[PDB]
Amino acid sequence: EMLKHEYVKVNGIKMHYVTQGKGKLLLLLHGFPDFWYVWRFQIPALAKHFRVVAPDLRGYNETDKPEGVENYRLDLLAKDILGLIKALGEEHAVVVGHDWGGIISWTLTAFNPQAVEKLVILNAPHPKAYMTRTKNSLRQLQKSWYVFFFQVANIPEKILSRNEFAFLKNMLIQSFVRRDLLTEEDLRIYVDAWSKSGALTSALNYYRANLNPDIIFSEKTVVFPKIKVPTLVIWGEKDVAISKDLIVNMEDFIEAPYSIKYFPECGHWVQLEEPELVRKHIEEFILK
Template sequence: MGVVTAVKVFLGFAVVYTIASFWSVVIVLPILLKGFMSSPIRFFQRRRREIKPACLNDPSLGTHTYVRLQGLRMHCVVNGKEGKPLMLFVHGFPEGWYSWRHQLREFGQDYRCVAIDMRGYGETDKPPNVSDYTMDKLTGDIKQLIPALGYESCVLVSHDWGGVIAWAFAEKYPDMVDKLITMNAPHRKAFADIMNHNKKQLFMSWYIFFFQLPWFPEFLISHNDYDILQKSFRGADGKVIGSMTPEDLEAYTYCFSQPNTLTSAINYYRASMRTSIWQQAQPREGKREGSGKITVPVLTIWGDADKALHKDLPELARKYNTDYTLKYIHGCSHWTQQERPDVVNEMMKEFLKRKKLE
């Protein structure tokens, strides 16, 4: 590493940690102080959950299986007959395979539906290092998984972090994606565009910077028996969003209370930021860019009441795709496929019937 590059990397990390510290004081400390003052005993409580909620073993959702990838054992839930076209579901944060329960039931008649726990989540292995969660590793898992399931390509369905991975995968391996469906997931280039020019998104993304700190983010989410995790799936009225139930909420809490899961999930953000700082520090001729526009047919479904992602993001992604369909769900939050599953499923069916643009 040259001196100039080293200085740029150092300054990049200095800026990130300064912003992270700022948000820790402005947002995080008041949350923790309020929790401590209201219930000091519960504040440090983290109940270890030994018994899996029954909904995670619901046979109507599919069969649980494991696929051995290079250096990783991946947990999958499979619904649908062998020989049907593959529909692969990739979840976001803080979720897991279970976030696709409505789609597993709906599309199992016509597709071989496979919902995965991504690396670090649920019953999939949890590599220990931040470097184990780079985009190359995440897209590499999908690249290995498709042939391991006996297929050459798939309909790739994704949400949030899963969508970020799916965008990158479709750009890198277009022959392995028949159609791409994303839900409230920013295309990485569109996200970079808006972060550079829109202060509102910068403020909405405060947690990304906060997650760069060691230990503290894990403590914030897990304190008071994972209260913040549970509140993320509730509306302003305190009720769980959409069709979700208290048992669904407990299912996520169970998964994230298991050893190392929370750190592994947050490491996605840490690896992404470190990669970005490194790439920005490289000389122009050393910077890596994607191959260009995504050429596979893309459907983006967007809940326009998302509090973490700016409403302009899905439209900004249009210029990075050659065959792009955008559908909004008015009043829907970030948790698209769980809050409005019937609407989402109908939009998916309509898109899947359409032929590719020539």
């Protein structure tokens, strides 16, 4: 097998993806500020057993980038993935989501359980956990300083991109518990992805559509069906973006069997820091 790049129309947008392997559809969904490439250490190994598909989400890298905050609501992003499963000629998929990819995955699974065989979450809080607990967690609000920063128009784009995205490289490198995690080559590939016209605005629109202060401080209770598909949560405990307050007590959200694998020596980018152990836990979960 060899890593192939494709494009497919889904839900009115053209979505780029890399793919390798045959078998069950296994989706790997990245978050901010990543793209398919974050999955570089898992694609080959998983492709031994599965039809691995790693897309660029709406707004990222080679995928279409519709204009306006409203086009980045969670409901539309989950519909993109539902549409992608269909367009790949399948009824369901194993769905693995990191970060925004995880939030989307939780949403897809909750509202369209028939389309998801098994769910894997890496370092992505359950949306109802986030909406309920964040306003009550000083620690989370503090960690979410940058979420508030990203609400403001234009200024965050300018600050993040200036000097060849120095600010963004720093934010990323500050978050890793492993040194020299991105090579100079890696950083050049990331900058190409970041530099795609409209990408940075589109990425930041995720926070403006879904995590504005109105949603965070809403008094209204959030309607979110229980998760009814077998679920694995992988969690690097040294996460600079997410408090443990947000991942404890998943019971009230998940009716199907679930398990949580804590990585006490990893942070947010658990798939980069223990690539082989993550790959293993994912394989074992699917194949048993």
